[PDB]
Structure 1
Amino acid sequence: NLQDARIIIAGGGIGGAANALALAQKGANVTLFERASEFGEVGAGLQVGPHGARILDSWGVLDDVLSRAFLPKNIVFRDAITAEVLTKIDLGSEFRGRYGGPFFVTHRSDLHATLVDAARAAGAELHTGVTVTDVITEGDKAIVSTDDGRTHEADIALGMDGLKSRLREKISGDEPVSSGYAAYRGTTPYRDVELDEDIEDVVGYIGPRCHFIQYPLRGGEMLNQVAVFESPGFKNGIENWGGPEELEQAYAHCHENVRRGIDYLWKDRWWPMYDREPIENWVDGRMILLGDAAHPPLQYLASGAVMAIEDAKCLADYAAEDFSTGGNSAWPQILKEVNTERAPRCNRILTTGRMWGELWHLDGTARIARNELFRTRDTSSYKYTDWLWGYSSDR
């Protein structure tokens, strides 16, 4: 356990919250600083595969999360132009038996609130309205500066300040890399959506330079919709690229089922999609970058928040194993071991994710090949998914 340890967490997104919970459950003294004046997340969906579900179950929060979630029966890929089913990933008992938990979907806001509530219940001292301005290592302590003029001492610090991380600048001068794709979201009352057939699955329509995803939320009561498309504005050097004037044309070549979808999306805000080139070293002295600060992906594998959750489980588990006997002196080794375990995993998701999205967005003959590949696969094989859903940090 981590009783005498002190950890400061910079950032209170899903990653920071998950880390607060994991560490506080091990008995650590956790202090978390979040810049925003309230904890919160977007009231739209995310997908959590069993690689995340199993961890939430270990922390004792999965039953509760599931009480407000949706359990899809399959992931269904469809051609965005013909609406033809290409393949399905079955999420039933064989799947859940293999991977140790369910694939579920839920509101980001709910998942976040649940983690925050559990972290507080486990003893984590959470602070909103507080920006971490600097982290340095002096001797065997991390010294953390905040925007009220104060400094704070801890054994380690977690840089969990997201894609646009300023703490990352301590380790890397790299900048976010534009995908040239923009994402729009929407949630609609289920019944309020015009559907030919009912939706009980995650449905992804994949087409030339675009995709469109639908899944239910909150026990079937709401439908989440997500449109991602290649922005003409980006390649022309627009700074505020991917705006909603681009949507109609981006989907004009698609099936009516996809086109009808566009009307339900929120249009007042959107998410231009950036990632970063993978980096091997996430550690500066007694600071480690985790979550999006370390490994921000494009969302095709729907695993960014899951990675941050996995980061929390690995850090907590590895620290509790080593700190118990080695104490505070052991932290730099612990952070090195966590980085060594996490970097190859996460970096593969970053790189493979890029290719996966590319595979979704193919056109012409390449699309014809892609479609046939999907249709004719061995659906009993797990070779495409075991590396993702079957991973564990347990040693």
Structure 2
Amino acid sequence: NLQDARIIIAGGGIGGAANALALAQKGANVTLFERASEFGEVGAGLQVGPHGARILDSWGVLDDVLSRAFLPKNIVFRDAITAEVLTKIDLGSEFRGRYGGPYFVTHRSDLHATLVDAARAAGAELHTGVTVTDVITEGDKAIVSTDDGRTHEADIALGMDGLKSRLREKISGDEPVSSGYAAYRGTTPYRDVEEDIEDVVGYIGPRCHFIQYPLRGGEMLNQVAVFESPGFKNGIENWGGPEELEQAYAHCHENVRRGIDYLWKDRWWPMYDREPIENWVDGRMILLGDAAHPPLEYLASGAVMAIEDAKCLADYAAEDFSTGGNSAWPQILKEVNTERAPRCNRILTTGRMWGELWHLDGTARIARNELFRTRDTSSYKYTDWLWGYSSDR
């Protein structure tokens, strides 16, 4: 275990909170700096497959999380134009048996608050309203600077400052790559939404998709609309605005079009990712979460990847640190990097392809529809790589 280790975490999102919890459960001294003045996430849904569920259970927080979550029966793909079901992924007991946990959906804010509170309970020292302005390595320590003039010493630091990470600049000059798709969200009271839904339902169509699922044991309905923005292709800086919505879904089924009216219009998420990179480490600093591997939303695994990052790091560290102390941190970081890069980078890359597959038109959509419909649903070859992965060695 990590009793003698000091780790500093720049960033307090799902990633940084998950890592605080994982490490402090191992007895490490953890200090986390979050820029925002309170901890919080959007009060909208996210999806957490069994690859994340499992890990939350090993942390002892899954039951509590499930008590405020929803357990869908299936993932259902529908054609966005005809509303016709193309296929289902069964989330029943064979699925739970094989992957070792439920696929569930919950409020981001609830999941985030659960991890913060459990990190706090495990002994992690968390600080809001504090921006990390620099990390360098000197001798065998990470030196972290904060925007109040202080510097802090630790054995390693974790750069978990998200998609627009400034700590990533130590390792790479790349910029975010726009997919040209904008994402809108909504949460409505179930009853108020205009039949019944017990699943994650994804309507896929040319240049768009529309996702729905219940939350809080059937009481809320989350809705997400993602569409290709004409404005991005014409050079607009603040592209994807709400005026584009109606024209974006005009070709789609009524079920999809009714859905548009429940969305929040005062805020949206233009969708970026980054080209995959191999190396995430700089001396005694490692990038994790969106800072190292920000994906497009299609595999619903960005936050799950950060959760995996946390487990892997804590597991690899607790194994190696017991015997070689502070001196072993760089080898540990490297080994975490080697395990995590291939896995996460395939998600980045396959996520782009999967997304493109949702958005086909013309003859390509006919082929796509028929491919989904005629598949062997007992086979797990499209999904084992994603849901069946573990970092255990």
Q: Same fold (TM over 0.5)?
A: yes
Aligned mates of 2:322, 2:9 — CA distance in 1:
21
Shift of 1:339: 0.1
Shift of 1:146: 0.1
Cα offsets for 1:292-318 (capped at 9, x unmatched): 000000010000000000000000000
Aligned mates of 1:391, 1:202 — CA distance in 2:
22
Cα offsets for 1:49-95 (capped at 9, x unmatched): 00000000000000000000000000000000000000000000000
Aligned mates of 1:144, 1:118 — CA distance in 2:
24
Aligned mates of 1:262, 1:171 — CA distance in 2:
41
Match of 1:193 in 2: 193
Shift of 1:280: 0.2
Aligned mates of 1:83, 1:328 — CA distance in 2:
58
Shift of 1:226: 0.2
Shift of 1:229: 0.1
SS at match of 1:63: helix
Shift of 1:175: 0.1
Shift of 1:158: 0.1
Cα offsets for 1:306-358 (capped at 9, x unmatched): 00000000000000000000000000000000000000000000000000000
Cα offsets for 1:351-392 (capped at 9, x unmatched): 000000000000000000000000000000000000000000
Aligned mates of 1:262, 1:243 — CA distance in 2:
13
Shift of 1:255: 0.1
Matched, 1:56 2:50: no
Aligned mates of 2:260, 2:73 — CA distance in 1:
24
Match of 1:336 in 2: 334
Aligned mates of 2:64, 2:200 — CA distance in 1:
21
**Structure 1: runs of 5+ lacking an equivalent:** none
Aligned mates of 2:278, 2:218 — CA distance in 1:
41
Aligned mates of 1:326, 1:67 — CA distance in 2:
41
SS at match of 1:383: coil
Shift of 1:154: 0.1
Shift of 1:42: 0.3
Match of 1:40 in 2: 40
Shift of 1:218: 0.2
Aligned mates of 2:345, 2:297 — CA distance in 1:
13
SS at match of 1:349: helix
Shift of 1:393: 0.1
1:96-245 equivalences in 2 (<5 Å)? 96-194=96-194, 197-245=195-243
Aligned mates of 1:264, 1:172 — CA distance in 2:
40
Shift of 1:111: 0.2
Cα offsets for 1:108-166 (capped at 9, x unmatched): 00000000000000000000000000000000000000000000000000000000000
Cα offsets for 1:215-265 (capped at 9, x unmatched): 000000000000000000000000000000000000000000000000000
Matched, 1:391 2:383: no
Aligned mates of 1:138, 1:214 — CA distance in 2:
49
Aligned mates of 1:325, 1:309 — CA distance in 2:
26
SS at match of 1:30: strand
SS at match of 1:371: helix
SS at match of 2:309: helix
SS at match of 1:348: helix
Matched, 1:249 2:258: no
State the TM-score, normalizing by the size of structure 1: 0.99
Please tell me the root mean square deviation across aligned C-alpha atoms, in Å. 0.2
The share of aligned pairs that are identical, in percent, is 99
SS at match of 1:228: strand
SS at match of 1:254: coil
Aligned mates of 2:111, 2:248 — CA distance in 1:
32
Aligned mates of 1:27, 1:90 — CA distance in 2:
39
Shift of 1:43: 0.3
**Structure 2: runs of 5+ lacking an equivalent:** none
Aligned mates of 1:119, 1:310 — CA distance in 2:
16
Aligned length: 393
SS at match of 2:209: strand
Cα offsets for 1:1-36 (capped at 9, x unmatched): 000000000000000000000000000000000000
SS at match of 1:60: coil
Aligned mates of 1:237, 1:66 — CA distance in 2:
43
Aligned mates of 2:247, 2:362 — CA distance in 1:
18
Aligned mates of 1:366, 1:42 — CA distance in 2:
36
Aligned mates of 1:31, 1:118 — CA distance in 2:
14
Match of 1:284 in 2: 282
Aligned mates of 1:348, 1:279 — CA distance in 2:
11
Shift of 1:177: 0.1
Cα offsets for 1:149-204 (capped at 9, x unmatched): 0000000000000000000000000000000000000000000000xx10000000
Aligned mates of 1:200, 1:219 — CA distance in 2:
10
Question: What stretches of structure 1 move > 3 A for 4+ residues in a row?
Answer: none
